Amino acid sequence: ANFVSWKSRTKYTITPVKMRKSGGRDHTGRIRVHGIGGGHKQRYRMIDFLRFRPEETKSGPFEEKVIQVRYDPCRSADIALVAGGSRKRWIIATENMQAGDTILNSNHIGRMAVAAREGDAHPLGALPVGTLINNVESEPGRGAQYIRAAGTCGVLLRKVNGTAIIQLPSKRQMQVLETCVATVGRVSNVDHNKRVIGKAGRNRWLGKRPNSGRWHRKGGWAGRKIRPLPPMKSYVKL
Amino acid sequence: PLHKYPVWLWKRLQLREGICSRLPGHYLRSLEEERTPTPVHYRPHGAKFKINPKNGQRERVEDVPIPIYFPPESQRGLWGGEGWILGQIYANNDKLSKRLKKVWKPQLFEREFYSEILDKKFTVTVTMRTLDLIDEAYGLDFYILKTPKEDLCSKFGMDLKRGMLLRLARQDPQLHPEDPERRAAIYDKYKEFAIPEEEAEWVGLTLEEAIEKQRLLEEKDPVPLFKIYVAELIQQLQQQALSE
Amino acid sequence: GADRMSKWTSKRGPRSFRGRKGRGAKGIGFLTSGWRFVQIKEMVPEFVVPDLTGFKLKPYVSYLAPESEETPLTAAQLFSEAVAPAIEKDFKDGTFDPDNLEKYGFEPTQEGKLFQLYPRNFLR
Amino acid sequence: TVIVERWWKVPLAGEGRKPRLHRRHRVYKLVEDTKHRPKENLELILTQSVENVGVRGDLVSVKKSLGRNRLLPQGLAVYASPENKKLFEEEKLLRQE
Amino acid sequence: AYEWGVRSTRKSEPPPLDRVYEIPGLEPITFAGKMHFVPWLARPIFPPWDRGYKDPRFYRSPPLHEHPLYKDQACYI
RNA sequence: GCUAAACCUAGCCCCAAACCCACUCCACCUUACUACCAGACAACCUUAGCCAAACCAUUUACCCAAAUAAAGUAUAGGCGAUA
RNA sequence: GCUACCUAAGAACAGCUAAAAGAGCACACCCGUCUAUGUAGCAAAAUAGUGGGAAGAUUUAUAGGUAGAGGCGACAAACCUA
RNA sequence: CUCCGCAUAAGCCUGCGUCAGAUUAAAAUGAACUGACAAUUAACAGCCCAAUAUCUACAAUCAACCAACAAGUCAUUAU
RNA sequence: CCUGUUUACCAAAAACAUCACCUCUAGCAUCACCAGUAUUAGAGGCACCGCCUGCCCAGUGACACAUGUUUAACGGCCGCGG
RNA sequence: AAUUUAUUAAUGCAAACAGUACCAAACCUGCAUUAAAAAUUUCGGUUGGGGCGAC
Ligand SMILES: [K+]
Ligand SMILES: [K+]
Ligand SMILES: [K+]
Ligand SMILES: [K+]
Ligand SMILES: [K+]
Ligand SMILES: [K+]
Ligand SMILES: [Mg+2]
Ligand SMILES: [Mg+2]
Ligand SMILES: [Mg+2]
Ligand SMILES: [Mg+2]
Ligand SMILES: [Mg+2]
Ligand SMILES: [Mg+2]
Ligand SMILES: [Mg+2]
Ligand SMILES: [Mg+2]
Ligand SMILES: [Mg+2]
Ligand SMILES: [Mg+2]
Ligand SMILES: [Mg+2]
Ligand SMILES: [Mg+2]
Ligand SMILES: [Mg+2]
Ligand SMILES: [Mg+2]
Ligand SMILES: [Mg+2]
Ligand SMILES: [Mg+2]
Ligand SMILES: [Mg+2]
Ligand SMILES: [Mg+2]
Ligand SMILES: [Mg+2]
Ligand SMILES: [Mg+2]
Ligand SMILES: [Mg+2]
Ligand SMILES: [Mg+2]
Ligand SMILES: [Mg+2]
Ligand SMILES: [Mg+2]
């Protein structure tokens, strides 16, 4: 079919971009995921998940000022508009973030730990043990791919040979380098899991279609299954 | 009604008229030739007669080749006459079991060879058989120059041949311009495959590539009639003067 | 229920179809921004009409005329009438060479001309 | 290299005719795949000294993977052809004299 | 990090050249003389074409750095 | 007495022979028959099944390059049907 | 080009109550509960009356997409040109 | 009587204008059938745009109080 | 439970969906899920709320594999005489 | 229910490949194994109708 993806823009901007829905269909045009269709129209706001992204003419630790914390219809968390130097960008807001705060983005790993403030971005080897974190990355410069959802938070367990042991929201441990940047604190909208849809129509506004009426018989996959926490996932090559 | 000629002869009737009739002779002979390829995916009997064990009589035996399907990606490499075998099988080799579709594919590798006549390295896709055939010919140049077309089974292998034969006929000095002695030594090893340039420039070309070539050799703006009539005039005036 | 055996015309189809289809009239310009059409004076055919004053010929010819036979004109017929006389004269004079063929009337090329013969760039 | 064989017999065609193939003549049975047979060595002549053999013009039956991958590209070893043996035979002859 | 623009929306890589252009001393037979594409002939390589005359409706401005009024020191307007 | 009835041409069929194969101008792969602008998509790949076997499951004739004859012979085949 | 679901960009919803509403009364509009009529008919599924909904999971025009070993489906073995 | 009506879009393509008629409607004046002749005139509408880089956080709802979520249809500059 | 949905052309319903509750799976990026990241997404069951959801892992299945684990998994949850 | 694993996935061996007595990432190909999801075909007779029972 003549399907073209809307994710064509090649330059970053804070302007809300118009995106088109899929309906659970792939480029072939056939349904590949059920339960997706319709919903209120939405404009996408690019999010910069690389906190430490010095400007073209600048290098080293920099600071940004929070301008506005607003609602995002493309994610469960809230986004914040920060401005440093001559540029502006969207980021994931933390639990306690207001218009007027000044956040820090640094890559310096000092001999000693640093007093951790919420919203600040430091490497994993520059934070004390037991510190809550969010938006971690697998390797340096990869970009934050974890702990992005509302209220989610990790914790730093220990540091070993330039490697940090991270505990994910699924109570699973992940091992990465100490040069990977993470943000301190929890993610915004802590009470998102306590929302009540109330009526079926409100799920049709979110782009969710009703389940199939066909009756299925359960198999052996069903039923409680007490299995042990899987081993630690390591992105460090030795 | 009926056709004057059978349908299987229509393709050779197109080579008698038109621009194809104006093609070289040696090229046209190489097309109608249907020499048998070398067996790859089956063993030949080796003899013409055998003694059937059941009755003990001298029966005749014939070698029937197995159809081989050559994918288009085989014309960009050197598979050595190998290809896919599109056939059937019996489950558990039992005739009374049901019959299934089976495809046997060859194992391909991406190697790098060097040609001495061309002084250039190519990254071709090959099979284990091609590597053995290059070791029996003692180089890639002999393999490309000895092996015929029906055994090469590659358009790229036939274009290399044309490239090599053109340098053996033109005696191209571009090969090692700064090493005359070395160059001469290379052409003295492949002197048994030398073919005149006139005949070595049509090697490997298909019927569609040759027609386009011959068309370009005949393409020329028509001569104006102003010049033709002047020649007739001047030539005619001279004859008139003699009679006077 | 559609007539697939009827001539497709600009009168058929929705608004976008009826405006894009024409009738065979050649264009004399282009559309600019704002749907503003720009007319090119050089694209409009200029009629070259001659003066018909004191012209003897008339639409018809009197029947009191001979039944001359038809001799279609050929290239060889045109060469001998116009080009040959000049060549014969120079041949007798003793000064004739191919280099001067352009002087006799021959055209080596058609470029740099207003009315080229092939491919012709003028109207009947 | 996959080598196969037909289950059913093919009737003789004659002298100068092509056989008549049927739908049953597409059924094959795997006879042998040459990629599972014992490997063989590669007879080569050494143009330069090598860790395995430091004598020039010496015959070595190395594995196919060793000669094709390293020796032949580098030019350390040349193909042990009837003509190459003669060239190196002369050098050996000079040493004897 | 995360790059913007999916490869499916980007311009597809040009088709790989035929292997006849890798063999020295050999002229490829293309469909340039036929004035139209055919699958059984090599794809020719045309040289960069220039209109040769000015046409406002089809004008292409020169690169930025070539503009006369170009300064390294930026001016915030 | 109405309605009707009646007809012999049009051409067609099977062979033989011979290989076959265009044109005034203009328009036509975009919504064909649409005068006029930046492109690069490209072709190849075992026919299956009905049916027969009184089911069906291996199997079941399909011009393939000379008429005849060798011969429905050798041979193949749930060694059955049949080939 | 019917229909099922989806995509893009559009359109429509009086008046009253409450003004919060997948809220109520009730036009347009959508549906088709019960009854009679009709049964080669006005109609290869209609007519009259009576009814359900009518700011929402609403209705609807336009262009496009998913094709039969399949698609689509708030599963009726529905619907995919009577 | 008024179930409407006028117009636009879509679709259709000369399909109740004149003359004539043996054709036609239940109807030998009429006519949607036949033959000939005539006819719809752009301002509405359709048919658009030089290049490169760059800009575009702050709904709508009389948009002002006010209150929301399902978070929204409209903008540039430089050469 | 509710508004809602279905057998266009004999069934509009107690059938389907549904807010809620629960089980299972997944530690991740450049064409769907998603330009998303376990307070997420997907596969399913039941059916708002309120009081509750009891016993059984022998068998089948699934998971883990060395025993073993698991029923809001398929399913099951006595009898004779006085 | 009988037949089958072509297809898909996993695993193993082979093939291919390297390095300092030990041993080589995956992709691809071939041969096996196990699942998944499917495919082809059938569902006998007698019978005071058939089914059940019986034969
Ligand atoms: K039957
Ligand atoms: K009409
Ligand atoms: K309906
Ligand atoms: K109802
Ligand atoms: K169990
Ligand atoms: K009876
Ligand atoms: Mg949100
Ligand atoms: Mg979303
Ligand atoms: Mg559900
Ligand atoms: Mg259900
Ligand atoms: Mg049968
Ligand atoms: Mg419609
Ligand atoms: Mg939409
Ligand atoms: Mg209202
Ligand atoms: Mg309501
Ligand atoms: Mg109501
Ligand atoms: Mg529906
Ligand atoms: Mg049902
Ligand atoms: Mg049923
Ligand atoms: Mg206008
Ligand atoms: Mg209630
Ligand atoms: Mg019904
Ligand atoms: Mg009903
Ligand atoms: Mg229910
Ligand atoms: Mg229970
Ligand atoms: Mg008792
Ligand atoms: Mg039986
Ligand atoms: Mg019976
Ligand atoms: Mg009975
Ligand atoms: Mg019984």
Alpha carbon distance, N-terminus to C-terminus of chain B: 67
- Centre of ligand 10 to C-alpha A215, Å, is 5
Distance CA A136, CA A146 (A): 6
Nucleotides of F under 7 A from a protein CB: 15-20, 31-48, 57-66, 74-78
* Angular region, C34: left φ>0, alpha ψ -120 to 50, beta rest: left
- Centre of ligand 24 to C-alpha A209, Å, is 18
Q: Residue A87's beta-bridge partner residues? A: A84
Phi, psi angle pair for A186, to nearest 5°? -90, 170
Could you say which DSSP state residue E62 is in? Answer: P
Residues of chain B positioned with their CB less than 8 A from the CB of E29: 205, 209, 212-213
Q: Closest nucleotide to C14's CA, by C1' atom?
A: H10
Helix axes B225-243, C84-93, angle to 10 degrees: 50
Query: CA B153 → CA B123, B147, C92, D85, E42, distances in Å?
Result: 18, 10, 69, 32, 19
- Centre of ligand 14 to C-alpha A201, Å, is 20
Q: Residue A121's beta-bridge partner residues? A: A105, A183
Could you identify the residue written with the tokens 């049953």? D24
Q: What's the distance, CA B18 to chain centroid?
A: 23
Domain limits, chain B: 1-243
Tokens of B103: 């495809």
Report whether A21 contacts A33 (CB < 8 A): no
Burial class (CB in 10 A: 0-12, 13-18, 19+), C16: exposed
Q: What's the distance, CA E74 to chain centroid?
A: 31
Exposure letters B15-48 (e unless 16+ CB within 10 A, then b): eeeeeeeebeeebbebbeeeeeeeebbbeeeeee
Cβ within 8 Å of residue E10, ≥6 positions away: none
Report whether A185 contacts A80 (CB < 8 A): no
CA of B41 and C1' of J23: distance in angstroms? 35
Domain limits, chain A: 1-106, 107-187
Query: CB of residue C37 closer than 7 A to nucleic acid strand F?
Result: no
- Centre of ligand 23 to C-alpha B243, Å, is 116
Tokens of D91: 């050098």
Q: What's the distance, CA C92 to chain centroid?
A: 38
Residues of chain E positioned with their CB less than 8 A from the CB of B140: none
| CA atoms within 13 A of residue D36's CA, in its CB half-sphere | 6
Fold of A107-187: SH3 type barrels. (2.30.30)
Query: CB of residue A39 closer than 7 A to nucleic acid strand G?
Result: yes
- Strands A121-123, A133-134: pairing kind: unpaired
Q: How far is B39 from chain D (nearest CA, A)?
A: 10
SS3 B132: helix
Task: Say how many C-beta atoms besides its own lie within 10 A of residue A179's C-beta.
Answer: 17
SS3 B216: helix
Amino acid letter, A15: T
- Strands A43-44, A17-18: pairing kind: antiparallel
- Candidates B107, B144, B142; CA nearest to B126 is B107
Contacts A–E by Cβ distance under 8 A: 28
Could you identify the residue written with the tokens 């000022």? A65
Q: Touch between chain C and chain D (3+ CB pairs, < 8 Å)?
A: no
The verdict on a CB contact (< 8 Å) between E41 and B120 is no
Name the residue facing D3 among B43, B64, B86 (closest C-beta). B43
- Strands A78-84, A62-71: pairing kind: antiparallel
Whether B221 has its CB under 8 Å from any CB of chain E: the answer is: no
Phi, psi angle pair for E15, to nearest 5°? -60, 145
SS3 D28: strand
Experiment type? cryo-EM
- Centre of ligand 19 to C-alpha A222, Å, is 27
Task: Say how many C-beta atoms besides its own lie within 10 A of residue A102's C-beta.
Answer: 13
Report whether B107 contacts B128 (CB < 8 A): yes
Distance CA B227, CA C76 (A): 11
Helix H or strand E encompassing B243: helix B225-243
- Candidates B181, B173, B175, B144; CA nearest to B161 is B144
CA of A41 and C1' of G22: distance in angstroms? 19
Q: Which CATH class is domain A1-106?
A: mainly beta
Query: CB of residue A4 closer than 7 A to nucleic acid strand G?
Result: no
Cα radius of gyration rounded to whole Å, chain B: 27
| CA atoms within 13 A of residue C101's CA, in its CB half-sphere | 13
Phi, psi angle pair for B236, to nearest 5°? -75, -40
Same fold, A1-106 and A107-187: no
Cβ within 8 Å of residue B22, ≥6 positions away: B214, B218
The verdict on a CB contact (< 8 Å) between B139 and D79 is yes
Burial class (CB in 10 A: 0-12, 13-18, 19+), D53: middle
Distance CA C33, CA D81 (A): 78
Helix H or strand E encompassing B180: helix B180-187
| CA atoms within 13 A of residue A116's CA, in its CB half-sphere | 24
Name the residue facing C84 among B224, B225, B233 (closest C-beta). B233
Q: Print the SS3 string covering chain A.
A: CCCCCCCCCCCCCCCCEECCCCCCECCCCCECCCCECCCCCCEECCECCCCCCCCCCCCCCEEEEEEEEEECCCCCCEEEEEEECCEEEEEECECCCCCCCEEEECCCCCCCCCCCCCCCEEEHHHCCCCCCEECCCCCCCCCCCCCCCCCCCCEEEEEECCEEEEECCCCCEEEEECCCEEEECCECCCCHHHCCCCCCHHHHHCCECCCCCCCCCCCCCCCCCCCCCCCCEECCCC
Distance CA B164, CA B136 (A): 19
Burial class (CB in 10 A: 0-12, 13-18, 19+), A90: buried
Alpha carbon distance, N-terminus to C-terminus of chain A: 46
* CATH 3.40.5.10 describes domain D42-95: yes
Q: What's the distance, CA B3 to chain centroid?
A: 32
Q: How far is B209 from chain E (nearest CA, A)?
A: 6
Whether B208 has its CB under 8 Å from any CB of chain E: the answer is: yes
The verdict on a CB contact (< 8 Å) between B62 and D13 is yes
Could you identify the residue written with the tokens 């028509």? B222
Q: How far is B213 from chain C (nearest CA, A)?
A: 26
Tokens of A22: 């899929």
CA of B138 and C1' of J54: distance in angstroms? 86
Distance CA A132, CA A122 (A): 12
Q: How far is B112 from chain D (nearest CA, A)?
A: 9
Tokens of A94: 């933390």
Distance CA C16, CA B8 (A): 53
- Residue with smallest Cα–C1' gap to G58: A201
Report whether A45 contacts A90 (CB < 8 A): yes
Tokens of E38: 């055919």
Query: CA E52 → CA C87, C114, E55, E59, distances in Å?
Result: 41, 20, 10, 12
Query: CB of residue A53 closer than 7 A to nucleic acid strand G?
Result: no
The 8 Å CB, 24+ separation contacts for A24-29 are: A27/A1, A27/A3, A27/E8, A28/A1, A28/A3, A29/A1, A29/A3
Distance CA B181, CA B187 (A): 10
CA of A143 and C1' of I47: distance in angstroms? 42
Q: Closest nucleotide to E64's CA, by C1' atom?
A: H52
The 8 Å CB, 24+ separation contacts for A231-236 are: A232/A165, A232/A172, A232/A173, A232/A174, A232/A175, A233/A172, A233/A173, A233/A174, A233/A175, A234/A174, A234/A175, A234/A176, A235/A138, A235/A139, A235/A174, A235/A175, A235/A176, A235/A177, A236/A163, A236/A175, A236/A176, A236/A177
- Strands C36-39, C29-32: pairing kind: antiparallel
Q: Which chains touch D (3 or more CB pairs under 8 A)?
A: B
Q: Residue D6's beta-bridge partner residues? A: D28
- Candidates A168, A148, A152; CA nearest to A74 is A148
Report whether D76 contacts D47 (CB < 8 A): yes
Query: CA B92 → CA A189, B14, B97, B240, D9, distances in Å?
Result: 63, 50, 8, 97, 20
- Candidates B166, B141, B35; CA nearest to B78 is B141
Q: How many residues does chain D have?
A: 97
Alpha carbon distance, N-terminus to C-terminus of chain C: 45
Query: CA D49 → CA B139, B194, D45, D66, D75, distances in Å?
Result: 22, 35, 11, 15, 11
Phi, psi angle pair for B155, to nearest 5°? -75, -35
Nucleotides of I under 7 A from a protein CB: 2-3, 16-20, 23-33, 35-40, 42-47, 57, 61-64, 69-75
- Tell which of B159, B202, B214 to mutate to test the E interface (max E CBs under 10 Å): B159
Query: CA A89 → CA A94, A123, A146, distances in Å?
Result: 15, 21, 20
SS3 B240: helix
